[PDB]
Amino acid sequence: EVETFAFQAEIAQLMSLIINTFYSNKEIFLRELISNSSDALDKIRYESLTDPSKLDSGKELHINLIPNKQDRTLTIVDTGIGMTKADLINNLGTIAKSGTKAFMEALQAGADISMIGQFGVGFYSAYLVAEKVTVITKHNDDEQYAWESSAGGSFTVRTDTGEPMGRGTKVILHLKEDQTEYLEERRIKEIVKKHSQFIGYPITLFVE
Amino acid sequence: EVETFAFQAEIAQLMSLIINTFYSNKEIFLRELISNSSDALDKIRYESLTDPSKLDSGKELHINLIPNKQDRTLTIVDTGIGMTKADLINNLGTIAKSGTKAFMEALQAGADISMIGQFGVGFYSAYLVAEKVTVITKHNDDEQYAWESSAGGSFTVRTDTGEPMGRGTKVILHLKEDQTEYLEERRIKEIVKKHSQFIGYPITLFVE
Numbered sequence: 001e002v003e004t005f006a007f008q009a010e011i012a013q014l015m016s017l018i019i020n021t022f023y024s025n026k027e028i029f030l031r032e033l034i035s036n037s038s039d040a041l042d043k044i045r046y047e048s049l050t051d052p053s054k055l056d057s058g059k060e061l062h063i064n065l066i067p068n069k070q071d072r073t074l075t076i077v078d079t080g081i082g083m084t085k086a087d088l089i090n091n092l093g094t095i096a097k098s099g100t101k102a103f104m105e106a107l108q109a110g111a112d113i114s115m116i117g118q119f120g121v122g123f124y125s126a127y128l129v130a131e132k133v134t135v136i137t138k139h140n141d142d143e144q145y146a147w148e149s150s151a152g153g154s155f156t157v158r159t160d161t162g163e164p165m166g167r168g169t170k171v172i173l174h175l176k177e178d179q180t181e182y183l184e185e186r187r188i189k190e191i192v193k194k195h196s197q198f199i200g201y202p203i204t205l206f207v208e
Numbered sequence: 209e210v211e212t213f214a215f216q217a218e219i220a221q222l223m224s225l226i227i228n229t230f231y232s233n234k235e236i237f238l239r240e241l242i243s244n245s246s247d248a249l250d251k252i253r254y255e256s257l258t259d260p261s262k263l264d265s266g267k268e269l270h271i272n273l274i275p276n277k278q279d280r281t282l283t284i285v286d287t288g289i290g291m292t293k294a295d296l297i298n299n300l301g302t303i304a305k306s307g308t309k310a311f312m313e314a315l316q317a318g319a320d321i322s323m324i325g326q327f328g329v330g331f332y333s334a335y336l337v338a339e340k341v342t343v344i345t346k347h348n349d350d351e352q353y354a355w356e357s358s359a360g361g362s363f364t365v366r367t368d369t370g371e372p373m374g375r376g377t378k379v380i381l382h383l384k385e386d387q388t389e390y391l392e393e394r395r396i397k398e399i400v401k402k403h404s405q406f407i408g409y410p411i412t413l414f415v416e
């Protein structure tokens with residue numbers, strides 16, 4: 001069963017801005033997603049010090065970058081803390097409303113699209129390069145979900161019946177037809193080397 | 209009763225490096241502490257969406273910068289999530305060991321002291337400008353503590369019997385005698401305007 005939800009008007013606005021504004025420096029989407037994964041991994045690691053059983057769903061704390069040309073997807077996989085249904089539908093959600101607003105205001109004031117991360121909404125930078133984003137995620141306290149949006153003002157969530165992931169998050173970027181350079185090994189290596197050099201987790205770039 | 213603890217050898221190393229290395233761009237300590245406060249405020253705000261009673265210890269989410277020339281202190285106050293005794297003594301602690309190591313390695317490799325934040329140990333940047341740091345903190349689940357260190361390989365923790373703070377963290381920087389410019393309104397304003405422009409919380413600079 002697939003549930004369909006309306007983004008709040010402000011997030012829809014933001015998504016449309018990212019999609020519509022002419023902005024050539026798109027590569028920053030990857031720094032933002034890697035950094036999102038890094039924060040999710042910090043959080044699970046932190047929680048684990050006071051409750052070791054939080055790691056029963058897997059001990060390795062890592063980030064995998066997985067390009068697939070047949071499918072035209074770039075997937076960022078982490079084993080961080082994962083997201084609950086309430087995060088997907090409500091909490092993220094509420095936090096994104098105020099980051100959006102602040103980010104909008106700063107843009108009017110000459111700030112730049114690359115600064116999206118300072119406003120806690122870097123995940124939406126994925127729409128610089130993706131026509132569709134699917135997010136698979138498993139939190140310890142909850143079941144595995146698939147969230148999905150091509151923007152246009154709505155998203156879906158359903159319980160996921162794919163390969164079970166243990167704990168973590170997979171962001172599957174369905175790339176715009178003119179953004180396939182982000183499937184290329186030397187392009188991804190360049191981008192990681194330039195913006196994500198000091199991430200405190202191993203980042204494995206899978207080959208095709 | 210005052211408990212005295214030994215820093216792990218690696219944190220002592222890091223503290224000594226920050227204290228000893230010739231490095232003129234000291235102002236970055238303030239961006240790091242403001243950013244620490246911002247993350248503590250994000251965390252309490254996040255937790256509050258699933259448990260509103262977490263805010264019974266105060267609803268305002270803010271950052272105050274308080275200079276005092278008589279005392280020669282600059283205090284960064286937040287109402288974020290606060291720290292428990294276990295954070296002070298163990299958890300921070302364990303997380304700082306690996307950030308330290310990575311930060312050490314990057315420095316050998318030509319990275320710069322200003323990059324300390326990428327390695328989760330920006331709090332120690334306070335020793336660029338402070339001969340002594342006192343940290344007062346209250347977490348919902350625990351009592352109010354005073355932590356204190358002048359480096360030299362040890363720190364103390366005691367239960368604090370000062371003004372009760374509700375919930376949050378006060379970082380009191382006892383400034384080195386040659387670092388009093390950080391007590392000055394126009395200097396602090398300059399620094400906040402330059403490095404902390406987009407923080408998503410009101411930052412009030414108190415006057416003397």
Ligand SMILES: COC(=O)c1c(C)n[nH]c1-c1ccco1
Nearest residue numbers: 088092093096120121123135147
């Ligand atoms: C990995 O997914 C996300 O970050 C996400 C989803 C699925 N909804 N809203 C968000 C979000 C909005 C702002 C920060 O995160």
Ligand SMILES: COC(=O)c1c(C)n[nH]c1-c1ccco1
Nearest residue numbers: 296300301304328329331343355
């Ligand atoms: C506000 O205080 C701190 O950040 C703190 C204290 C009191 N111990 N270790 C830390 C710390 C080490 C690394 C990140 O945080």
Ligand SMILES: CN(C)c1ncnc2nc[nH]c12
Nearest residue numbers: 036037040080082083123169
């Ligand atoms: C909210 N948000 C950005 C996220 N939450 C949990 N795990 C994630 N992995 C990548 N992004 C994540």
Ligand SMILES: CN(C)c1ncnc2nc[nH]c12
Nearest residue numbers: 244245248288290291331377
């Ligand atoms: C670990 N750490 C950096 C901190 N934890 C909780 N509250 C804080 N306020 C400033 N820094 C904080």
